[PDB]
Structures are given as C-alpha cells and as structure tokens.
From a paper:
RNA exosomes are key players in degradation, processing, and quality control of a wide variety of RNA molecules and have a structurally conserved 9-subunit core common to eukarya and archaea. The common exosome core is composed of a hexameric ring of RNase PH subunits ([name] and [name] in archaea) capped on one side by three protein subunits containing RNA binding domains ([name] and Csl4 in archaea). This architecture results in a barrel-like complex with a continuous central channel implicated in RNA binding in both archaea and eukarya. Whereas the archaeal exosome has an active phosphorolytic RNase PH core, eukaryotic exosomes rely on the additional hydrolytic RNAses Rrp44 and Rrp6 for activity.
To trap a complex of the archaeal exosome with Pi and RNA substrates bound at the active site, nonameric 3∗([name]/[name]/[name]) complex from [name] with the [name] point mutation in the [name] protein (Rrp41D182A) was used. This point mutation was previously shown to completely abolish RNase activity but is not directly involved in RNA or phosphate binding and presumably allows for both substrates to bind without being turned over. [name]/Rrp41D182A/[name] mutant exosome crystallized in the cubic space group P213 with one copy of each subunit in the asymmetric unit and the full 9-subunit complex is generated by a crystallographic 3-fold axis. The density observed for the Pi in the 1.8 Å structure presented here is clearly tetrahedral (proving that Pi and not Cl− is bound) and facilitates accurate refinement of the four oxygen atom positions of the phosphate as well as determination of binding geometry. The small error of only 0.1 Å in coordinal positions for this structure (as estimated by the refinement program REFMAC) allows for accurate determination of the hydrogen bonding distances. This analysis reveals that the Pi ion is bound by four residues from the [name] subunit. Specifically, the phosphate is coordinated by the side chains of R99, R139, and S138 as well as the main chain amino groups of G137, S138, and R139 (numbering according to the [name] sequence). A total of eight contacts with binding distances of 2.6–3.2 Å are observed creating a strong phosphate anion binding site. The two phosphate binding sites are almost identical and reveal very similar interactions between the protein and the phosphate. The position of the Pi-binding site is highly conserved between archaeal exosomes and RNase PH and PNPase enzymes indicating a conserved mechanism of phosphate-dependent RNA degradation among phosphorolytic exosome-like complexes.
Numbering used by the authors:
A (entry chain I), B (entry chain I): 6 to 114, 117 to 169, 171 to 181, 184 to 196, 200 to 217
C (entry chain B), D (entry chain B), E (entry chain B): 8 to 241
F (entry chain A), G (entry chain A), H (entry chain A): -1 to 5, 7, 9 to 176, 180 to 275
Write the structure that this text describes.
Amino acid sequence: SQEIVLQPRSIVVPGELLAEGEFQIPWSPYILKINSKYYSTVVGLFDVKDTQFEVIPLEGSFYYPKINDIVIGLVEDVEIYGWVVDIKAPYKAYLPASNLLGRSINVGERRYLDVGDYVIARIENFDRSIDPVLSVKGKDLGRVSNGIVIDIMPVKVPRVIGNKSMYETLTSKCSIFVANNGRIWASRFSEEILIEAIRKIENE
Amino acid sequence: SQEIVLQPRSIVVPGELLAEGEFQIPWSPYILKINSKYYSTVVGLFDVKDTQFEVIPLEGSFYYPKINDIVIGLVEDVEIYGWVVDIKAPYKAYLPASNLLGRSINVGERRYLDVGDYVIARIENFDRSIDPVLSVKGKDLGRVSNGIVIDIMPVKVPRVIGNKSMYETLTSKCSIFVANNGRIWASRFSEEILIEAIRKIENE
Amino acid sequence: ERPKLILDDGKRTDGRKPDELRSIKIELGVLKNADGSAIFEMGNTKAIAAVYGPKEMHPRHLSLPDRAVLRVRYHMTPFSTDERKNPAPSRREIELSKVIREALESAVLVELFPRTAIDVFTEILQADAGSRLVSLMAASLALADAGIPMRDLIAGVAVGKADGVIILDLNETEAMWGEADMPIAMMPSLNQVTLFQLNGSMTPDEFRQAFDLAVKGINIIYNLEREALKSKYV
Amino acid sequence: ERPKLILDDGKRTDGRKPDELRSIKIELGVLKNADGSAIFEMGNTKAIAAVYGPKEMHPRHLSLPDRAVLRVRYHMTPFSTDERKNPAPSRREIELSKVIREALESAVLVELFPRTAIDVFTEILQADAGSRLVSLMAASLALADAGIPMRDLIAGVAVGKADGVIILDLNETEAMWGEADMPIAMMPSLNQVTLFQLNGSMTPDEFRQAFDLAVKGINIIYNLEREALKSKYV
Amino acid sequence: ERPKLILDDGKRTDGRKPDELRSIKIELGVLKNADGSAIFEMGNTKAIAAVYGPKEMHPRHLSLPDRAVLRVRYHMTPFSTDERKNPAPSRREIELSKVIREALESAVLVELFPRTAIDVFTEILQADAGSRLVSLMAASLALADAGIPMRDLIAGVAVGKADGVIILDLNETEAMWGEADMPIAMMPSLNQVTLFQLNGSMTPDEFRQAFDLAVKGINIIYNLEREALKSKYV
Amino acid sequence: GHMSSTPNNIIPIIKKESIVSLFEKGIRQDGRKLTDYRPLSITLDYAKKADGSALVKLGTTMVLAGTKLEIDKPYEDTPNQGNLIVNVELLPLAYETFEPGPPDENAIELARVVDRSLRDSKALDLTKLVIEPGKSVWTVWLDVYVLDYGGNVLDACTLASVAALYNTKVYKVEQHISVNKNEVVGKLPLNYPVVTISVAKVDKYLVVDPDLDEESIMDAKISFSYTPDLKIVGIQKSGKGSMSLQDIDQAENTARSTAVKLLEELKKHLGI
Amino acid sequence: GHMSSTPNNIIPIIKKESIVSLFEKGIRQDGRKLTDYRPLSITLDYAKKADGSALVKLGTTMVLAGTKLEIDKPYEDTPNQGNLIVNVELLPLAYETFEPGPPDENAIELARVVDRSLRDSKALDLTKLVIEPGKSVWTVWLDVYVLDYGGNVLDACTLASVAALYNTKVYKVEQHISVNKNEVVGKLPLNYPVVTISVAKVDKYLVVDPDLDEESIMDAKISFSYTPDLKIVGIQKSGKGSMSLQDIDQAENTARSTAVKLLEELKKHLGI
Amino acid sequence: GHMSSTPNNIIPIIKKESIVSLFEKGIRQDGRKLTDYRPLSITLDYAKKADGSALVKLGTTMVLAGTKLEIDKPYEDTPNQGNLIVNVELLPLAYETFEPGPPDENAIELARVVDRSLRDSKALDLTKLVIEPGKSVWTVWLDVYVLDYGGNVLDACTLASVAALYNTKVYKVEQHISVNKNEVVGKLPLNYPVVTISVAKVDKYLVVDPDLDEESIMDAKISFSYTPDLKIVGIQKSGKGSMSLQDIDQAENTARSTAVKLLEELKKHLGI
Ligand code: NA
Ligand code: NA
Ligand code: NA
C-alpha cells in the first residue's frame, strides 16, 4: 500500500501531499511526515531518486551549516581570541585565532583578517546547540586577496555545479570556485560571468 | 550578665529581641547581633540548644545553596559546555558537560539532559562570589526517569525528615527521597502522600 | 442596521451573492531586500508582507533554545482607512499582531532554527474589512517566498451575518453594520484552524452554518494561493 | 480651611480624638503566586503588597556585587480615589515609589543576597490618606511573609495639624484641608526612622509635638503588626 | 515679509551691515565634572556644551570595533525661546542632534579609541537664530577642552537673504522673515565643510555669493576660537 | 512602533503525565470534572471608593474590577450614547515573570475581548447612559486588575467585569451639570449578565476552566461568550497551537452547556 | 530625552573597487552615467482609500506616499492658511536592520527635509486651503512609507510626495460644515512640482542618485531641491564625512543640470 | 508602568577617613565649618529670554532656573488662582553617569520637593496671578536645570527657583486678551523668600550642605525648608539609610540656625 502522488519534477508548495504509505526516507527539512502521509514544506521541485523521494527547494537565501562544508565568509568582528564571520547562514561563524596562527595568541598581538575581509574556510564544528566553528587549515583556504565574490541563493549551488557540467561551462567563458554557502570566488569584460550566474538562479 | 529573653519554642518575628549579653553564636541569617543584643530577622521559632540559641525560619520558598548539599534541579537551558539548572535558589545552578560525561565535549555532539528534565545532583562549588556548580558523580545522582517530584518550602526539609522519624512514617504509607532544596523524589492512589507533605508544611 | 445589507434581489450591497468571495489578486517577490514578500488583495482590502530570517536574535536571552522566535507586526497605513488612521499602534493593532503571530506559529517549522528570529512585517495599504486575514495570508505567502519551511499555507476568510443572512467574505459596510463578523483561518490540507474570532452575535446553529460556509471559501482561496506560488515556475 | 476639622466637642470629622488611630486590619498570605503578600487597611485606606525573590537579576549589569537590589512599585488603582485616577504613573507615584524603596532599604538584609533582585509591588485599592505608609507597612509585612530577613518591621503613621490642633493618623479630609501632614515610618525596636516627610507648615515646637505623638501611634501599630504575623502560628 | 529687514540706510534691524557678525564671547572650562566644557555666545544666541569620555560603551554591541561612537544631544531649554519651548525633544531637536553629530564625526579622531563612546551634550540657553552652529562650536571647543584629539576646530555661521540682500549671521527676525537661511560649518584649516543646510530659497548665483560671504565670517570666528583656547595659557 | 514576539512556566516532562492521568475518568488533579469550573467567590463592593466593584476568586485566580463614572460629551458620531472604556492590568503582583509596564499584548487582548463581549452582548445598552442627548452622557470606566494569576484569567475578568457593572451606583445629577455623590439614584442598567467560557485543548481532551498547570501544557484554548438565551456574543481562539474544525465544534457544545450553569451561579452572586 | 549616536551594510574591500572601476569612463555598475537617475516608475492613485497617492519605484527603492485631508481650525497665528503635516516611515519591511518603532532620526530628517522643500518652494500655497477664513481650513496629512530601501530614499520620498499631492482629490464641503465624499470638486492646487537631487561624493567622483552599494561607500551626500525656474529651495548635507567647498559647488552645478531632466520626467508622469 | 530600583561614585576606603578626619575639630576638607554652606553666587537675569532667571553657584554645584509666564484658563476647581508648574532636569552635562532621558526619579523628587516648599510656604500666592477671575490667569512655568552636579543639588534648586521667581518680569496684558512684551508692568509678587537646608548624617556627625564626596559617604540626608519667620514649610528625608529620632531633632535645630543666615544672604542677592 504505497504510492507517490505526483509526477517527478512537479513544482511543489508548502502543505502539498507528495506520498502516502510507509517509506524509509532520511528526515529532511523539506518534507514533513504525518503518520503515513508526506508533505512538502517549501516551494520546490519534487524529485524521485529510485524508491526514495525528495523536494528540491526553489526559494531561500540562507545557507544551513553542515560540518566539513567549504564556505566563503565575510569577517564582521575581531574579538580577543578570534573572528566573527558572516557565512550567509542563520548563525554567525567563528574562526579561532589559534586555528589560523597554529599557536596561541601572543602578548600585544587585524594583521591577518580584519572587518571586511573575505575568508575561505571549512566548517569544523556545528550542531543544533552551537554556532559554526571555522577552520582555515586546508590548502587554498584563508584570506582572499584578488578576484571577486558573487552571491547566489544557496539552494542554487547544486545547479551552478550541475557531474560538475555547469562548473565547466562557466569556466569556458575565467576561473571560479563554487562554495557551499552560495558564494562564488572568481578581464573586466569577462567579469560578466555574473550575467550567467543570475541566469542559473532565474532559469533553473 | 547574660539572658535569653524568650521561652524556647517561642514564635518570633523580625526585630524581636531574643537575647541580651555576650554569647558566642555562629553567625546566622536568622539572627542579627547589634552590640550585646540579638534579634530575629524572620518569622520563626526561637530554639535554644544548650548554651546556644537559634531561630528556625517558618517562611521562605527559596533554598540557600550549601556546598555538598544534594539537590533536585530542573534543567532550564542547554549551553555549549553544559546545562543551566533551576535548584529553587536565588541563583541558577550549572552542570558542566564534562562532569556528566567524564570527558570533554566531542565534535558535533540534549541526548543526556534537555530542557524540562529533573536531575539529582550534589552542589560542588558555591560561595558568595559565584552561582552553584553541580556534580552528578555520586550514585543515584543524575537524570530522574520515573516517579514524581513534590515541592515544599526548603525551610521545611528538616521537619519532613524529623532522627529521620518523619522520613520513616511517610514511607510506611511508597518510596521517597528528601532533597536539601525542598524537593522530594517519590500506586496512583498512594501518590496521595502529597496530602501528607502539605500537612507537614502547614502543621509544623 | 441603517443601510440595507441584503437587497430585494437577495444580493449584497456590492452585487455579490451570500456565498460569493470578492476578487483576489496575489503578487509575490515584490520587494528586493526582503527575504520573501507578497501583496494580497481581496476586493478593496490590500496588504503587503515582508519576511526576514531566520537570523540570530541578538539579546540573546529572548531567544528560545529549541526553536525560532516569530516577530510579527500588523500595521495599517494612515491612508488605508476612510478617515486618517493615526500611525501610532492602536490596541486593535496590538491584538491583531498577536492573533496573526499565533496563527503563524502553528504553521512555521520553527524547531528547525533554534536561537533565531523570523521577522514578519505586514502593512495594510487599503482596509475594506478582512484586513487581519489578508495580512495573515500575505505573511504566509511571503514566508513561502522566503523559503522558510512550513507545514502548510494558511488561507482565511471572514463569514458573518447581515440582515439575518449568513454571508461570505465581508466588506466594510457589512463589518460595520451587520450582526456578526467571524474571521477564520486554516491550514487547509491539515484540517487545522489557526485563527478564529467572532464579534457581534449568532445563534449556535448560525455559527455552524457560517463555519461551514467559511470552509468552502477557504478552499477556493487556498487553491489560488497554491497556484500563485507555482505561477512563476509553471 | 473650608470644612470645620475640629468640632465644638473637640473631636474630628470622623468621631476620633486628636490622639486616636483609625481601625487597622491586616491579612497575610493573601496571594498564591507571590513569595509573600499582605493586605493592610487603616480606616478606609487599603493596600495590597506582593513580594518576589530574591532571584538573579538578569541584566546583569544593574545588579550589585555585595547585596540585593530592591525593586519597588507604589501604584494606585484608578478606582481607589474619589475621582478616577489615570492608571499611567504620575509624578507623585514616582516620588512615593522611591521614598518607600528607600525606607525598605534600611530594613531588608540585602547583603545576604549579592547579585539578586527582591521585587516589592504595592497597589492602593482605596485611598483615604496615609496610603504611602499603608503601602510601606503592607510591603514590610509581605517581606516577612516571604521569609526575607529584615532587621525589623516598619510601622508608620502620618501626624499633622488641623484647625491648630496636632492630630494623629489623618484622613483625606484632614490631609486636604489641614495645615500640615507629616508621614513618619520607623523600625521601632531599633529607634530608626525610615521615612520622614512633611507637607504644609508647622512651627518647630509643633513639629516636635507631632513627632512625639507619631511615635506613640507607631508603637501601637507595630504591636498589631507583630501580632498579625504571629497569629497563624499562635 | 512684514517688518522691514534692510532699512533705508542699508543696515539691518539690529544696526549691522550685511557683512557684519554679531558679537562673540567664548568661555572654556565652565563645568567641574565634565571632561571638557564651553559656553559660546553669538549675539543673543548662547549654548553650553559638556563632553565626557572616551569611555567604554557598556552595551557593548552598539560599540564599533575600529573607532569611538559619538553620542550627541542638541536640546533647547524651555526658557531659551520667546515663548516657552516644551522640554520633550521635538522633531527639530532630533534632526539637529544628527546634523551636529555628523559634523563632529569628520573632526573627531574617533579611530584612536575603538569600542568607546564620546558623549557630547549641548543646551541652548538663549535662542536668537544660529543655535545649531553655536551648539556645534561650543561642542568643538568642549572637545578641545577635554583633550580629545581632533583634526581641526569647527567654526560655522548662517548666511541668508533678507529683502533681497545677502546677509551674514542672521538673527531671529531675519531667520523668521527673510527669504533664505543657510547654516554652514567648516574645518577651516582643512577646507572641509562639516554642516551645510539651506531653508528658504535662493537663485544659484545668490547661493554662491552667500557661500563666499560665509567663508569670510567663518575665518573670523575660527581665529576667535583659536585665541579663546590659547588664552588661559597665553 | 511595536511587534508581537514568541514569548515560556517551563513544566517538567514528568508533571504533564500526572496532570492528564485522570482525564480518562473524566476528572483532573483537583478532583474536578472536565466540565467543572473551580470554586468561585464573588465579593461585591470590595473597593469602597469604586462606583461599583467585584473581587472574583476562581480557584487561585483573583481579579478585582472597579468602575468609576464621569460626565462627558458623547463622541460626535454617537450623540445618543454614553461610553464604556475597559482596561485590564496584569499586575506584577500576579505572577513572578510579570514585570511592570503599560499593558502588554496579553492585557490588551483581555481588555478587548471583554469589551466586545459586553458591548456585543447588548448587556450594557449605552443609549441608557445619556443625561442630555447630544450634550452630556455617562462614561463608564471599567478597570480590571488581575491580582493573582492562577489560570483562565479571561473568564475571571468577565465575571468581575459583569459583577462590577451590576454593582455600579449611579449618583444624582444636578442642573445649574454636577454629580452629587451624596445621593445614589440608581444602579447601572444591565439587560442581563454575560459569561465567557474558556475551553483548553489538552491532547485528546477538552477541559473547561484550565488552571495554571493545564494552561502550561495545552495546545490552544478557545473562549466563547454567552448571554442567558445562549446566543454566542464573542469567540476568541488563543495560543500558539491550532485546533481542528471538530475540536472547535465540540468545544462550543461543551462551553454552552457549562455557560448555563455559570450564568445561574453568577446571578445568585449578583442578587438577580 | 534622546540623543544621536554613531550607527553600519558592512561592505567587502574587494567590492568597493569594482563599484568605482568604471567611474573613469563616466559609468557605474548598472551601465548608467554618473549623472543619470535609475529607471523611474510613478503609479498614481495606487492606495485607493488615500485622497491622493503615488507609488514611486526608483531602481529598487520603493516609496508609497498617500494623503488624507481633514477640516480643522487654522493655528491661531495663521488664520488664513491650511496646514501641511509630513510624516515618513522607514518600514521594517524595507531593510533587514530596520526594526519597528516610532520614527528614528533618519525618518524624522527625511520628513523634515521633504516638508521644507514643499513649503519653501511655495509649490503648495497653504492660503489656498482655507474654507472659511479664521474658522475652517484643510489639513493635508502626507504620509510617506518607504517599502523597499534601495538607496537615495530622499529623492524617491520627494517624488512620491509631490505626485501624491498632485493626485489629491478635494471633496465637496457642505454648510449646515461636513465633507461629502461622494462629490470630488477639485484637486489640490499646486503651483508646480519640486524635485530633490542627491549627489554622493565617492572618492574623486560625484554621483547622482546613489544606489545602496554607492551609499555604503560614499564619504557624504548633499541634496539640492529645485523648482522649475531652478531656484534652489532646499539643501541638506548628510553623512559622517565632510566635503570641500569646491565639491559642493560642483555638486550643485551637477544637481541643477539633472533637475531639469527629472522635472520634465516628473511632469510627464503627473500629466502636466 | 514603572518602578524604583536600588541604583552607585564608588569611593575608596582610604578617602572616607580623610573626609572625616577634621570633623572632630568642627571642620571639613575644604576648611568649612560643619554648619557652613559653600561659597554662593547668584546671578540674576542670566537667561536673557526667560521672564526671570537665576544662575546659582553653590561650591561646584551649578543650577540655572528660568521662568516663562503664559495666560491660561484657571483649573475649574481653582477659578481664582493662577498656576505654578515646576520641572527639574538633571542634565547629562552635570555628571558622568547621567544619561539623557525624561526626568528620572531623582529629578522628579527634586521638582516636587521644591514645588511643595514654594507652595506650602505661601511665598507665591497664586490668587495674585488672576487676570480675569474664572477666565484668565497666569501660569508660571519654572524650569530648573542642574548644569553641574557638585552635591546638595536640592538646596541649590531651591535658591535658584526663589531667585528666578523674584526676577520674573510681568508684562502688560491688553484687552480686545494679549500679552504685550514691550511693556513690563511689574514683577511676580512674592511674600518672602524660602530656603531649603539639607543636613547629611555622616557617622556621628551632621553636616550642612554636603559636597559630592560627603554625599557619597553619608547614611542619609534630611532637608528642611524655612520661611523668614522660621516656620518649617517642608521636610524630606532621602537616602538608603535610616536616622534616629534624636538625629532628626538635632538636624532640624541645626538646619534652622543655618536658615537664618542663608535667608539673609539670599535677600542680599535678591535686593530685598
Ligand atoms: Na502585539
Ligand atoms: Na520611582
Ligand atoms: Na537625533
């Protein structure tokens, strides 16, 4: 006694019935299970991968932190022992001074990151109880000197990447990195890749 | 030149003269010494044990923390590194995550105590400068699964215990533990021990 | 009372049958800064809503450790009413802000975002009765437009009684001079009522007749809500 | 001034001699949520007081590191006065809240509870003069009822002058039309004055005569206070 | 409009030529508690200013991590005006507080003191036009008196137009009845304008004529400011 | 400017179960039936300088309502009516977390719900409060003070309000127009009492007159106002949670049945 | 009591350079010239219960102005004039950091700058708003709501205000004095439109109609108001930074040149 | 809604001892006797647009009082009296911790104590401020601004207030009723001056006119108001601490002795 109610790739809206029956779906913020019925919680695209289904959100300007995700943050404060970083989430991120320096803060020591710097970092700690902690340990993580940083809806990131098909089409125009939090590190003429980005976000 | 002014077991009220002369009484919140005169500071029962006297408070819904006391707390918040616990005092208590776990908090780790849980704990640190710190090291300390928790005026706890005479009379009705902070861990018919508790608090 | 509300042809002062809704127009994504936004028009009643968040609520002792706090404003512009409304919040606006917030609390999946605030701001641009519901629905739609998970959309309508006749979706004339005005809002797919109020007076049988009619209107409105959200994709 | 305040038999407008108090009624433990509570009636003047704490004061930069902060409200209900009093705090209520708080500060053993607040809320239910003292005494009693250590109870009375006669415990007629009104409150066992105010005018010899009479009334009131606190046990 | 503002001899209602300033008196160090203080009189317009800080701003989420926050009040006493001014801040005072603060922001070396507040309080004791500038200059001087580093002093004057004549440093008569009133304040050694406003109306050629005249008056005022600061040492 | 924010009496997990443990048998902690009000006491003329007053005790909830009448000009659009102004204050006396301030959204809601029920019931016919048509009318200031917050404050505010109104003395008006407070010429003219009945949804149960604990665990509550002919003269759902269509239908049926009894009790207290 | 405090759209170091990268060529990010306004849309009669209204869209800035007229007594010192009251609200809808409350200093400034430009321009001659000299006059309540804060809100508030005024219906006044809203007898009488032109200083460049990003990086801005004869009828410098004498001279020259074009566009939108 | 909270000039342990080290010899830090006021300066007509004013300097305490008179209707219950309205502001100029805002409880107390002493003294007989009985009277707005908070602000506010009142010009009233400010016809009619004398209890000593340091260490203070016949026309105990019956008796005896001298000084300053 199982059935999906909607064709795949259906446009879905909050409260819309997706499925009836017993499925064994990993919990998702985009689907609400009420006894043996499943509902979309968002404006989205209903997608069925194998015996399992999902809703792909089409709206939302916030990134939900995930441990080990790579983000582009914007430094917003310098505190005693580290930096507060905006990573476009409902929660501000924090980068410890000790992580960046490889040692504890010295006596009498904004030289490395000050307000307004972009920083590329991995999310090291996060859970429902805490704000995300950042690390700049990996290669090509740290302060961004050159280039630009383009913002998109985070729900769009998988579409800007596409078996990385879209990543490749853009770079055929120009060098870009597509972060998990809907920010994209990237002559002044070819800087009009942002014309393309804005097309991925309004034609998906 | 020494005298107690009042018969023992006298009902006493704030500002009431208890004694004149030089006694060597440990300081007590219930008695104020002004030069060679001693006054009750509370509504209470004046009691003389040997050459020493005291006032037994009859009013008050607050528990004053004492190191090594056993309390029943109610968890009110989960913080990064531990829990805020209501122990019915003028000060909120704190239980470190490290005390309960026997180790430091792991990456990405309300599974053990969340808002609304009762927890039986010993007061590990307290002084006039700090809020009480809790420990759940001892046996039968920790989260309370089953049973109920009955509230009384903390000033009543010595009367609910009584050479533990009253502790025994109640349990002849049913299993109960009488905490220092005026909370009592304890079929549905015999659950009417609370009829008795309310009698200890209004007939002492 | 003074003006006739049900005319000899059995129709209402604006031409409608007792069971007929006013015309509805919905626009989404109307504001550039807001995380989500909507304009909702139901006849001459029109509200705009803007949603921000979830974002960390600074205090932070006013946050909740297991869920988001909704912060909600219902406000009428001074030029939305027949005579100028003073822009300072009235007792009415204070009540209606709470009632609308509490309606949104059943719908918004606040437990997804502990320690945050989701801000919901509505403004009544034109008031011709039912503005608490039009604000509520504009909010529900703005929250959808913002991508904030909800268990369902909220659709609502006021039913009432005019010259003894049970009627659907009151205008200001009916609200002012009729016998009863009963705003109801639901999560229709979930069979749950989010807002329910009555002013005026009804027998208990009239109350049940009206409640039944409201459900019919709500189901029409809900389908318009769903279709409006889908239209930019469909 | 206008009405005669001392009649030909030497008595006052309500039948009392110059040195006679109005009737006093005290009730304790009247509210279930409050940590302590009291109603105090002195003739037709009646106040209720509720006490909460000590509890941690959240700010927490408004706390004191060596003692509790007292937070105290004197407020009159709109129907407590001959003509409606607007419920918004008046300048009078603001002054009287401070004066009452400062009187309680000498009595309450605040150094026992660093970093906390003890909240003391009083409401005047019926105002017929002396309401600042009746609120203060209801507070003192509510603090006792709450088990919050104090060096002494506070008892107080207003003395004054009417048609040239020094008088004890004024009613509203005397307060309005007499020459002087002097509220005094003490910790009587400690010989300490906690509140002392005069409005109107007195010669310095009249002032001393009045002060002396007040002490007599205060000692009567204090014994009633003590007996009221003991009565539920005795 | 009603009174003649330029008389037949070509002089103004108070005896001045079009290009003549009112008399100026400056006093420094007038308050004992303030870290710096000044009284500035320009004709019958008189302001006192008091400065406190830099000190740690408690919130502390309203502080800035790279500089001090200036907190600035422009307020008129009730007896400073021809008819009593209500002491509650008016919309005018709100605007003028911002305009004065923003003028001070270009001058004060706020980046020296991250996370602090510098409080600047001005009171208009007598208002006879130009009080926003007199408050601003009293503030600039009080900040100097307090030893708070600045890139320059601020001097300002209002120019305007009366009966078609471009005029320097308006009195209240000219401000009320003339055609234009244009307050300008500068850091004169740095060629920078800190405050610039016009009310009324001017042709663009009149505007340039007035602006030029203002600069002349500003340079006179600035030298008086410098000399006043030096006088206690010289 | 202002806005409504999600606020919490943090109740232990254990305590909830105990609260509902007897609902199956049709009874709560305190022995009362699901449809029973708590013990009610109404003391008229409690606030001796009020024109009328009532102290209502409903379990541990305590509310004092008082009236004062004044002579005013009618509002220009209602020249042939007096006025009714209802204010409710949730005193900081009443509950630990109630700090002082002007009325918050809860106190404002209570005032407005009570006001609508009085006005829409037609219990108080304001056309009766005219002294000189178009020139002088009575204004009835009704001030309702919650002294002890023990749950279901709305129902207690309604009872206090109605009792205070029925208790309201009207004084002689003298023409020259002055009120002569030495002469009571009447009582405020009411057509009938009104009651408000609040039903809380607690899991699968509906409970009349919820106490503090029950209000701490309820999903939502819905309040219904009735006159003696059992017309519905006001409804207000409140709380964060939703209720089904069927829950509301049932709640009204249950509220109405209780209203009949509550009205009769109230009349006994009022002497009508 | 109250005071003005230093407030910050924390903008990345990288983004600033990009914003000014084309100023050398006389153009900004969006392709527009340094002297160009953003695309302007003016929708008259948008707020159907307003006496007049206008929804102005200036790039992503959106402002709705509405009027309501009432009959009042003239202020005793101006018996032969009606009244104009301007209020501006920066709605919390408009921008993320705008929390609700009464008007803050920015909203109050905007209201007062707009009011001065309307009044000092003599566009609205208040002597025309008299009904009965010394007894009854029109009060024009102008309420200006910033719905979307996209930069240069002042210029948009001015345009909305003027358009709403020109759109304002005047209703028949009946003597017995009552307004009869069934009969429109006129429109509010304006002499001409007014515009306000804001020029932001960005390093060595002056930019007309700054957007949100440009306002985030500017030193200061100066706004100039003009009537069609290009009299200057208001000036206001705003922002933390200073400008040179020469910057202001240049700004005015540039503002005036743009005003000519903006006035002509505005007239087309108004139908005059 | 509002409430009074325990507030602290945290004074070093060492400094207290030094402050009292000379009290035994009958003198304080500044060389003055326990019964001496600090040096007093009173500058009349300081605020040139006030109807009357006085700048009082009492040691480092500085207070500017100013009056403005207006024509009003008498309050209906006092048709044969003008009005006196006293406002005191503790300016944020005055002391470091004084942030701006409406009057706090200290400023409100000061205003009310001053007002009572003026009114109860009968120094200002309000029946003299009638223009047309039952139709027009003077309202005296007295605004008292504490510019520098150097201790014993109350006594300085009283002196400033009385001096400003005595300095108050009364202007010609013209019938048609208008005030003609070109013609001064009188001064406000006062019967006599009043003074307020504050005595602070410092351990076993009583000190007249406490300075900031002495106010920082006192247990309590009591203020007594006097007219020249040395009637007591106001008393106010203030501060957290209590005083004995005997302390108050002594304080009054000491305050009265000082009042005689302070009145004579004040009269010299006023020219009476
Ligand atoms: Na609200
Ligand atoms: Na106060
Ligand atoms: Na401001």
